[PDB]
Design a protein around this ligand. Sequence first.
Ligand SMILES: [Cl-]
Ligand SMILES: [Cl-]
Ligand SMILES: [Cl-]
Ligand SMILES: [Cl-]
Ligand SMILES: [Cl-]
Ligand SMILES: [Cl-]
Ligand SMILES: [Cl-]
Ligand SMILES: [Cl-]
Ligand SMILES: [Cl-]
Lengths: 183, 184, 181, 186
Amino acid sequence: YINKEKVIKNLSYAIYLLKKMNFTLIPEVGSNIAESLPFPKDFKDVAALTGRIIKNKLGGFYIVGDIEFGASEHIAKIILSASKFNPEIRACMNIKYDGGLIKLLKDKFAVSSFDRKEEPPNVSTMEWGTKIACEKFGGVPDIIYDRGGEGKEPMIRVLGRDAIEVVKKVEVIQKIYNTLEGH
Amino acid sequence: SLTYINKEKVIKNLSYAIYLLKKMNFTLIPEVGSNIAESLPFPKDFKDVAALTGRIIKNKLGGFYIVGDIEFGASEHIAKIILSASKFNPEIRACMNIKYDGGLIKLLKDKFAVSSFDRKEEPPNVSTMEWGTKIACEKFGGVPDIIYDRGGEGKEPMIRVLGRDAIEVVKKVEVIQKIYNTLE
Amino acid sequence: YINKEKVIKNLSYAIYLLKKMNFTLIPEVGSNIAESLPFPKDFKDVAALTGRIIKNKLGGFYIVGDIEFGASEHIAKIILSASKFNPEIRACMNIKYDGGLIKLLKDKFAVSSFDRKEEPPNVSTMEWGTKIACEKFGGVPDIIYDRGGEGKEPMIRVLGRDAIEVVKKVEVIQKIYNTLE
Amino acid sequence: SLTYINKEKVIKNLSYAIYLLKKMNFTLIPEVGSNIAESLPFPKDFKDVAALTGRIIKNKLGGFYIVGDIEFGASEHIAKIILSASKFNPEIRACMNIKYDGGLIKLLKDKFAVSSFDRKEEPPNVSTMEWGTKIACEKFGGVPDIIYDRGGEGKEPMIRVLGRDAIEVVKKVEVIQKIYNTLEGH
Ligand SMILES: [Cl-]
Ligand SMILES: [Cl-]
Ligand SMILES: [Cl-]
Ligand SMILES: [Cl-]
Ligand SMILES: [Cl-]
Ligand SMILES: [Cl-]
Ligand SMILES: [Cl-]
Ligand SMILES: [Cl-]
Ligand SMILES: [Cl-]
């Protein structure tokens, strides 16, 4: 069974694991993690942080806000679009993008992307872009990235069955990034 | 002894500015969050500037979150703007970045000293903020109230309010917020 | 079956429910909620808030800190002690004491207690008191309270199988407490 | 002195006092948590007193948490102490409660003016904090640096540090803390 309680517990435990991590893959707009009920209809069936995850410029990061349903329309769009290709995919987290990192991830994760400059009119970038990457991959990959655009920083989006799986994948990505960030 | 005394003033100033802000219906929050900083007199490097260790971000439930503590060396980004404007007027030691809006900008030009810079002109081997601020000030003839830019590749458009201290800046932001509310 | 992940999720959801509750039974020393792994050996098999739940003078309350194992030796003493009587009891939360409230609760909940003045030497108040209240009851009751003592605020402790159940019990206790307004 | 002590001044003093506290290895935290307050000159009631809406509490994994915001009227409790002491010396506008320790007191009575009151001697229909502060001050012949009490039924003992403003209070507390650290490390 997968009800609201299950989703709130999933995200809570995912955050818990995240607090143990030396997570530095945070974009300028901050990270958020979300998970939906199975077969989500709208963003109200998707839970996330009411705040965001931001860097602590003195070292570490801050996890701001509470987990609540409908807290992130943005990521909800990604999960709702992806669920069309695979209803098992219910979670997503956006993290910082790095050119070198992506190259290295393609040999360890299923990766797909979309170009913001190719967006047609009358659509939501996140809905359109997710659809693009998924159709290109022929399913739901581990990661959906984009090199950004006018007023939009590049981004890496990690997907998975639930928020716990997502964070586990992010940990793998973080370990690789540690070496690059160090350099 | 001297530094201890000057730092205390900076901390108190930033602290009261946040206090005032918390009272406000601050909605001009950019997706990258806002921060507010203030420098000691005659700053040399970012460590002579204090600010939030976190940032001021939106709360989906409504309102906003003021995240972190006020500490020195907490904002290299903002510090770059202040130290650069300080080369045009040592009196300017505080700055805060808020949400950009075309319509609001026009209405601000009639009440504040506004200058700017464009991200595409940026010459190679330079810091965008140091360069942009310097260009914006060279262009204005001193340190204006507002320095904005339309953004660019991977960069959201921003409005930067400057002043003699954090409280000054916050007061200015409150005026701006009001001007902005007559639009929505 | 019942591992650390389960415990963390249980406490997390319990707090989630508590946050949406008009909870006013907060002691002067603040409340904390804790849950242990089955058959806990020491306080490190018990998770709880590293901070506490305290009153917000403006109104409402603040839930401070993170959920972590080994976060509370104090409540851990209570849970470890009760588990000897009934290993199915893995959670506990301390809430504000009220003489009248206890009177009303005694008719709906299984209640027991201990007296700080009767504490024998060379023991831990929480370990000894919990054991005493349970032997007095013939098992583990829903509530174990004490009228406090010198330098010690009186307290009502709510026990249960897991953190969610405990909060569910506190929700009822709170409604009853409100009849006292 | 050309200064005007208004609300802004008080908020700034409390804010800086907290900034200093966050840098301390403050372990003298009572079970009920600590709070720090400061009033405007000649306070009329607790509304003229500012303090944390929450409190300073122990972080079980190590360190402590400063909870809430600084706001006027936040603390009636510490306000009762300040307004009471101000009747003896209007210069006293701040107070912070910290964990009590008998040995620590003895080590302090040589560096600080100390006075106290007994919860068991409290008369009928009075506020413990107003009455106790009054007694302690009348017994000292003024406002001391410290007013403590050994606790009582349902009440943990406490050490209350007073001063002209929050910053002055925090400086005294730091001195006390260093002494306590030695006792702790013995
Ligand atoms: Cl989001
Ligand atoms: Cl994104
Ligand atoms: Cl900026
Ligand atoms: Cl505890
Ligand atoms: Cl207890
Ligand atoms: Cl004990
Ligand atoms: Cl208080
Ligand atoms: Cl006190
Ligand atoms: Cl009182």
